[PDB]
């Protein structure tokens, strides 16, 4: 239903050496 | 006390945390080595560089006034310190399910774009890590505004927590409970990533000319960085850009005071009005805590990235790595069947605690993994081949009774094998929780390792049940269903 | 600013030195005092002295410092428990009655060490400090806290920074206590503490004996609220080294133990000059070590210790009773009470026990309901003193009629007291079940629920006793006689 | 029993005006 659902605390990649 | 002494310790830290992975058998030892360096640095520093005079709740009135001035909803709820979840929102009137009770315009948000336009703009424009990692950029945006007394976001930052329960805050013996689990490697990576990032940016801030006007140049402690990334990882959100073309990461004031319960996502971004909008997940009577559903994350994700363990997480899951081996004589046919079905030949699948235990993709993989050559032929050749691949993830249309019995035998055996790789049993975990008095962080670690095994134990029992049902179907020479 | 604070503290002193405004005006006075304190508190910088590390960062130095001065430091560790806060946890098995903890006098903070400290000169001049060792302790704690080289710094740096005494409650949390017995003690404590802060704020400014105190440069309301809360939740009465007087003391390491039901197992050992604690019960390795604080009521635990104890077996409420001067038998009743060692009017207790009333209250109630003929037999003749001797003894009533009168009276009075509360027991249970409440709010509601549950149990006990003695009277049973 | 039992948090009188 929601076009832009907002996930609280969504998991992100913190591995700077991978990125 | 010496500035040159800390710069040498961080140089040592940067080198240690930039070395390649030590191999999984040496990761705990490397973890303790990094903890030892971090704690030496931390004990030579003065904690949070910026602390505020008043209590946390002393600043909630300012946040509400500041949110009200910029068009946010400020009526119908209040901030209360709840024992279980910490501070949260509590309804001051009856709020009905699906009522739009909370909304936050974009100007109140901290985003990667507001980072770019702030005092961090010059350093952001040249640093390769900041440009590539919005989550880190938002952590430094938060620290720079925190150490800026006239910051527009000060009413928000003065209400943030001072401490978190991410594993970055655990004692060594608290993380030790997680030895032999799936989760502990990500705990290791989090600790190594954060230590490397602090040391890297400490050196950058002390030498780069585009950092000469940052408040962090005068003071940037490990505690500062641990707080900042824990703030971002427990609270960050992905929202569209103003023009709706791309996505960015954001901290959303006021709304991020809501704690988590089971349910569905009821918060969406309204691009037309350019604001976050939350509708009530359920009826909240006056005096009841207002909850939202954060997302379908596992308890490993809640512990490591959100800093809590959620009892009765309906989306809890563990990983199971599976792949067709090239030593299999039927590798070529299985690989092509998998490919036509959109499934890699080797992958990390999930086992879930609630029904059903295995997803469509894992069921399809397991069926192919156990197929005979004649079954594989039926999935590759002829006018029904594509129809058969269409049903490979459907529990109602087995390939054959014998295929099911082999795949449920395999899953039962593999789930049983995985259970035996843990240093404790389920009954032993329940005994520790019942007979020992534990900190919150300790209980999170023990409940996490217990949860991993309970999901594998449920998979063992479900596979046993399924194996028996399809063996009964076989011996009964039952007619195989057809779609 | 400094002239402004001295202006505001002068108003606060005059406000809090005015006489009691009458019980019906005490809430309005309370809110007035709160308004003034918060206006001062908002213009100040919180605690004058804060420390860089976390509370648990400093527990090692406490142990090392305690070990150097002869205290036990093996067999336990400090853990942050969710239910009680930080406490001690056994690291080995500890048997009931084992002497596991001892603290020599050199480590304690006492009224004696307050006298010999930088506070000494002011102590000898101020009449409040000289009369009230508990306030002396609180200033001793503040002066040493603000002295970076104090001998007691390892202890001070491990103390809590906040408490759950009613001084820390929000106004709406105290409001739940309206119409209870306890709220007057909450009023007194708030007014006492504000008056004391303003009084000593001005005294430190005007006295030459206060010149060398760190408090001369900074002394905030938060300083004082923290100091008195530290003292009231932790202070202890010990003998002087002489053995001939009692003093008040803070006992490091030992006062990290939390409370459970049992008996007092801590005593002072004059010969070795140290506090000694033997285990109240077996503590297995990994179990929290508890002590029994004392036989205090939940009103005392809330107001003076900052917590509410479920299943407090020593809970009690007050009941004020007195013989009326309009009673035609006042003279005789007063004399019998006097010969029994009981005042004519007093504040007694109702307990949550099988008899709700002490021997002293039973004796008072018997005299309260005596006929003239019965009073004469307790005043005259060779058996009169024998009769007084037994007045507090349930087994030897004055007469069946006397018993029926006194239990009827108590049932009626406890019933009346229940009718003076703003809510019922069922309404309180509904609040605790249907609302999501802070810990402080829950302490307040459970406190007012507990008052009513004790009165209700007294009503039930009194009705049952009334029926028992009414039966003995209908059956004309022989009265017991002490022989 | 214990000649000098120690009560943790013994209640004291803080009313400086009455006492
Ligand atoms: N169901 C739950 N149980 C325990 N803690 C929860 C929770 N839901 C959210 N939290 C806590 O709240 C954080 C998310 S931000 C939510 C507001 C937060 N309680 C605050 O005081 O600012 C999480 O990191 C976790 O600390
Ligand atoms: N049974 C209990 N339940 C809840 N809190 C308790 C408790 N026993 C003791 N406490 C807490 O402990 C305090 C006494 S000092 C005991 C150590 C304290 N918890 C600390 O962290 O320093 C009390 O004021 C109360 O805050």
JSON list of N, CA and C in Angstrom, two decimals, chain A residues 2-19, chain B residues 133 135 196-197 235-238 255-256 265 267-269 271 294 297 305:
[
{"chain": "A", "resi": 2, "resn": "UNK", "atom": "N", "xyz": [1.95, 1.23, 0.78]},
{"chain": "A", "resi": 2, "resn": "UNK", "atom": "CA", "xyz": [2.82, 2.39, 0.92]},
{"chain": "A", "resi": 2, "resn": "UNK", "atom": "C", "xyz": [3.81, 2.44, -0.23]},
{"chain": "A", "resi": 3, "resn": "UNK", "atom": "N", "xyz": [3.91, 3.61, -0.87]},
{"chain": "A", "resi": 3, "resn": "UNK", "atom": "CA", "xyz": [4.89, 3.78, -1.93]},
{"chain": "A", "resi": 3, "resn": "UNK", "atom": "C", "xyz": [6.31, 3.93, -1.39]},
{"chain": "A", "resi": 4, "resn": "UNK", "atom": "N", "xyz": [6.46, 4.50, -0.19]},
{"chain": "A", "resi": 4, "resn": "UNK", "atom": "CA", "xyz": [7.77, 4.73, 0.42]},
{"chain": "A", "resi": 4, "resn": "UNK", "atom": "C", "xyz": [7.77, 4.25, 1.86]},
{"chain": "A", "resi": 5, "resn": "UNK", "atom": "N", "xyz": [7.63, 2.95, 2.09]},
{"chain": "A", "resi": 5, "resn": "UNK", "atom": "CA", "xyz": [7.65, 2.44, 3.46]},
{"chain": "A", "resi": 5, "resn": "UNK", "atom": "C", "xyz": [8.97, 2.79, 4.12]},
{"chain": "A", "resi": 6, "resn": "UNK", "atom": "N", "xyz": [8.91, 3.24, 5.37]},
{"chain": "A", "resi": 6, "resn": "UNK", "atom": "CA", "xyz": [10.09, 3.62, 6.13]},
{"chain": "A", "resi": 6, "resn": "UNK", "atom": "C", "xyz": [10.36, 2.55, 7.18]},
{"chain": "A", "resi": 7, "resn": "UNK", "atom": "N", "xyz": [11.54, 1.92, 7.10]},
{"chain": "A", "resi": 7, "resn": "UNK", "atom": "CA", "xyz": [11.99, 0.90, 8.04]},
{"chain": "A", "resi": 7, "resn": "UNK", "atom": "C", "xyz": [12.88, 1.58, 9.08]},
{"chain": "A", "resi": 8, "resn": "UNK", "atom": "N", "xyz": [12.47, 1.51, 10.35]},
{"chain": "A", "resi": 8, "resn": "UNK", "atom": "CA", "xyz": [13.26, 2.12, 11.41]},
{"chain": "A", "resi": 8, "resn": "UNK", "atom": "C", "xyz": [14.50, 1.27, 11.68]},
{"chain": "A", "resi": 9, "resn": "UNK", "atom": "N", "xyz": [15.66, 1.91, 11.65]},
{"chain": "A", "resi": 9, "resn": "UNK", "atom": "CA", "xyz": [16.89, 1.18, 11.95]},
{"chain": "A", "resi": 9, "resn": "UNK", "atom": "C", "xyz": [17.31, 0.23, 10.87]},
{"chain": "A", "resi": 10, "resn": "UNK", "atom": "N", "xyz": [17.00, 0.55, 9.61]},
{"chain": "A", "resi": 10, "resn": "UNK", "atom": "CA", "xyz": [17.32, -0.33, 8.49]},
{"chain": "A", "resi": 10, "resn": "UNK", "atom": "C", "xyz": [18.81, -0.67, 8.51]},
{"chain": "A", "resi": 11, "resn": "UNK", "atom": "N", "xyz": [19.11, -1.94, 8.21]},
{"chain": "A", "resi": 11, "resn": "UNK", "atom": "CA", "xyz": [20.49, -2.41, 8.27]},
{"chain": "A", "resi": 11, "resn": "UNK", "atom": "C", "xyz": [21.27, -1.90, 7.06]},
{"chain": "A", "resi": 12, "resn": "UNK", "atom": "N", "xyz": [22.45, -1.33, 7.32]},
{"chain": "A", "resi": 12, "resn": "UNK", "atom": "CA", "xyz": [23.33, -0.82, 6.29]},
{"chain": "A", "resi": 12, "resn": "UNK", "atom": "C", "xyz": [24.68, -1.52, 6.40]},
{"chain": "A", "resi": 13, "resn": "UNK", "atom": "N", "xyz": [25.48, -1.41, 5.34]},
{"chain": "A", "resi": 13, "resn": "UNK", "atom": "CA", "xyz": [26.83, -1.96, 5.33]},
{"chain": "A", "resi": 13, "resn": "UNK", "atom": "C", "xyz": [27.80, -0.94, 5.91]},
{"chain": "A", "resi": 14, "resn": "UNK", "atom": "N", "xyz": [28.50, -1.32, 6.98]},
{"chain": "A", "resi": 14, "resn": "UNK", "atom": "CA", "xyz": [29.52, -0.48, 7.59]},
{"chain": "A", "resi": 14, "resn": "UNK", "atom": "C", "xyz": [30.94, -0.90, 7.22]},
{"chain": "A", "resi": 15, "resn": "UNK", "atom": "N", "xyz": [31.11, -1.95, 6.43]},
{"chain": "A", "resi": 15, "resn": "UNK", "atom": "CA", "xyz": [32.45, -2.43, 6.09]},
{"chain": "A", "resi": 15, "resn": "UNK", "atom": "C", "xyz": [33.03, -1.50, 5.02]},
{"chain": "A", "resi": 16, "resn": "UNK", "atom": "N", "xyz": [33.83, -0.52, 5.46]},
{"chain": "A", "resi": 16, "resn": "UNK", "atom": "CA", "xyz": [34.41, 0.44, 4.53]},
{"chain": "A", "resi": 16, "resn": "UNK", "atom": "C", "xyz": [35.44, -0.19, 3.61]},
{"chain": "A", "resi": 17, "resn": "UNK", "atom": "N", "xyz": [36.07, -1.29, 4.03]},
{"chain": "A", "resi": 17, "resn": "UNK", "atom": "CA", "xyz": [37.09, -1.90, 3.19]},
{"chain": "A", "resi": 17, "resn": "UNK", "atom": "C", "xyz": [36.48, -2.73, 2.07]},
{"chain": "A", "resi": 18, "resn": "UNK", "atom": "N", "xyz": [35.28, -3.26, 2.29]},
{"chain": "A", "resi": 18, "resn": "UNK", "atom": "CA", "xyz": [34.53, -3.85, 1.19]},
{"chain": "A", "resi": 18, "resn": "UNK", "atom": "C", "xyz": [34.10, -2.78, 0.19]},
{"chain": "A", "resi": 19, "resn": "UNK", "atom": "N", "xyz": [33.55, -1.67, 0.69]},
{"chain": "A", "resi": 19, "resn": "UNK", "atom": "CA", "xyz": [33.11, -0.56, -0.15]},
{"chain": "A", "resi": 19, "resn": "UNK", "atom": "C", "xyz": [34.22, 0.47, -0.36]},
{"chain": "B", "resi": 133, "resn": "UNK", "atom": "N", "xyz": [29.78, 6.20, 1.86]},
{"chain": "B", "resi": 133, "resn": "UNK", "atom": "CA", "xyz": [29.04, 5.58, 2.96]},
{"chain": "B", "resi": 133, "resn": "UNK", "atom": "C", "xyz": [28.19, 6.64, 3.67]},
{"chain": "B", "resi": 135, "resn": "UNK", "atom": "N", "xyz": [25.90, 6.21, 5.78]},
{"chain": "B", "resi": 135, "resn": "UNK", "atom": "CA", "xyz": [25.72, 5.94, 7.20]},
{"chain": "B", "resi": 135, "resn": "UNK", "atom": "C", "xyz": [26.87, 6.52, 8.03]},
{"chain": "B", "resi": 196, "resn": "UNK", "atom": "N", "xyz": [38.62, 0.71, 13.23]},
{"chain": "B", "resi": 196, "resn": "UNK", "atom": "CA", "xyz": [39.33, 1.21, 12.06]},
{"chain": "B", "resi": 196, "resn": "UNK", "atom": "C", "xyz": [38.83, 2.59, 11.64]},
{"chain": "B", "resi": 197, "resn": "UNK", "atom": "N", "xyz": [37.51, 2.77, 11.63]},
{"chain": "B", "resi": 197, "resn": "UNK", "atom": "CA", "xyz": [36.94, 4.05, 11.21]},
{"chain": "B", "resi": 197, "resn": "UNK", "atom": "C", "xyz": [37.32, 5.18, 12.16]},
{"chain": "B", "resi": 235, "resn": "UNK", "atom": "N", "xyz": [18.83, 3.98, 14.68]},
{"chain": "B", "resi": 235, "resn": "UNK", "atom": "CA", "xyz": [17.77, 4.93, 14.39]},
{"chain": "B", "resi": 235, "resn": "UNK", "atom": "C", "xyz": [17.65, 5.34, 12.93]},
{"chain": "B", "resi": 236, "resn": "UNK", "atom": "N", "xyz": [18.59, 4.97, 12.07]},
{"chain": "B", "resi": 236, "resn": "UNK", "atom": "CA", "xyz": [18.57, 5.55, 10.73]},
{"chain": "B", "resi": 236, "resn": "UNK", "atom": "C", "xyz": [17.44, 4.96, 9.88]},
{"chain": "B", "resi": 237, "resn": "UNK", "atom": "N", "xyz": [17.06, 5.73, 8.87]},
{"chain": "B", "resi": 237, "resn": "UNK", "atom": "CA", "xyz": [15.94, 5.43, 7.99]},
{"chain": "B", "resi": 237, "resn": "UNK", "atom": "C", "xyz": [16.35, 5.75, 6.56]},
{"chain": "B", "resi": 238, "resn": "UNK", "atom": "N", "xyz": [15.78, 5.00, 5.63]},
{"chain": "B", "resi": 238, "resn": "UNK", "atom": "CA", "xyz": [15.94, 5.27, 4.21]},
{"chain": "B", "resi": 238, "resn": "UNK", "atom": "C", "xyz": [14.68, 5.97, 3.70]},
{"chain": "B", "resi": 255, "resn": "UNK", "atom": "N", "xyz": [9.51, 10.98, 15.70]},
{"chain": "B", "resi": 255, "resn": "UNK", "atom": "CA", "xyz": [9.04, 9.65, 15.32]},
{"chain": "B", "resi": 255, "resn": "UNK", "atom": "C", "xyz": [9.98, 8.55, 15.80]},
{"chain": "B", "resi": 256, "resn": "UNK", "atom": "N", "xyz": [11.28, 8.82, 15.86]},
{"chain": "B", "resi": 256, "resn": "UNK", "atom": "CA", "xyz": [12.18, 7.76, 16.28]},
{"chain": "B", "resi": 256, "resn": "UNK", "atom": "C", "xyz": [12.22, 7.58, 17.80]},
{"chain": "B", "resi": 265, "resn": "UNK", "atom": "N", "xyz": [4.61, -2.55, 8.73]},
{"chain": "B", "resi": 265, "resn": "UNK", "atom": "CA", "xyz": [5.09, -1.18, 8.55]},
{"chain": "B", "resi": 265, "resn": "UNK", "atom": "C", "xyz": [3.91, -0.26, 8.27]},
{"chain": "B", "resi": 267, "resn": "UNK", "atom": "N", "xyz": [4.52, 3.32, 8.58]},
{"chain": "B", "resi": 267, "resn": "UNK", "atom": "CA", "xyz": [5.13, 4.61, 8.34]},
{"chain": "B", "resi": 267, "resn": "UNK", "atom": "C", "xyz": [5.57, 4.68, 6.89]},
{"chain": "B", "resi": 268, "resn": "UNK", "atom": "N", "xyz": [5.17, 5.74, 6.21]},
{"chain": "B", "resi": 268, "resn": "UNK", "atom": "CA", "xyz": [5.57, 5.95, 4.84]},
{"chain": "B", "resi": 268, "resn": "UNK", "atom": "C", "xyz": [5.95, 7.40, 4.65]},
{"chain": "B", "resi": 269, "resn": "UNK", "atom": "N", "xyz": [6.66, 7.67, 3.57]},
{"chain": "B", "resi": 269, "resn": "UNK", "atom": "CA", "xyz": [7.05, 9.03, 3.25]},
{"chain": "B", "resi": 269, "resn": "UNK", "atom": "C", "xyz": [6.05, 9.60, 2.26]},
{"chain": "B", "resi": 271, "resn": "UNK", "atom": "N", "xyz": [5.65, 12.19, -0.34]},
{"chain": "B", "resi": 271, "resn": "UNK", "atom": "CA", "xyz": [6.49, 13.06, -1.16]},
{"chain": "B", "resi": 271, "resn": "UNK", "atom": "C", "xyz": [5.78, 14.37, -1.51]},
{"chain": "B", "resi": 294, "resn": "UNK", "atom": "N", "xyz": [9.23, -1.90, 13.43]},
{"chain": "B", "resi": 294, "resn": "UNK", "atom": "CA", "xyz": [10.46, -1.44, 12.78]},
{"chain": "B", "resi": 294, "resn": "UNK", "atom": "C", "xyz": [10.66, -2.08, 11.41]},
{"chain": "B", "resi": 297, "resn": "UNK", "atom": "N", "xyz": [13.02, -7.80, 10.77]},
{"chain": "B", "resi": 297, "resn": "UNK", "atom": "CA", "xyz": [14.40, -8.18, 11.05]},
{"chain": "B", "resi": 297, "resn": "UNK", "atom": "C", "xyz": [14.46, -9.35, 12.04]},
{"chain": "B", "resi": 305, "resn": "UNK", "atom": "N", "xyz": [22.47, -4.50, 15.36]},
{"chain": "B", "resi": 305, "resn": "UNK", "atom": "CA", "xyz": [22.26, -3.18, 14.77]},
{"chain": "B", "resi": 305, "resn": "UNK", "atom": "C", "xyz": [21.28, -2.31, 15.54]}
]
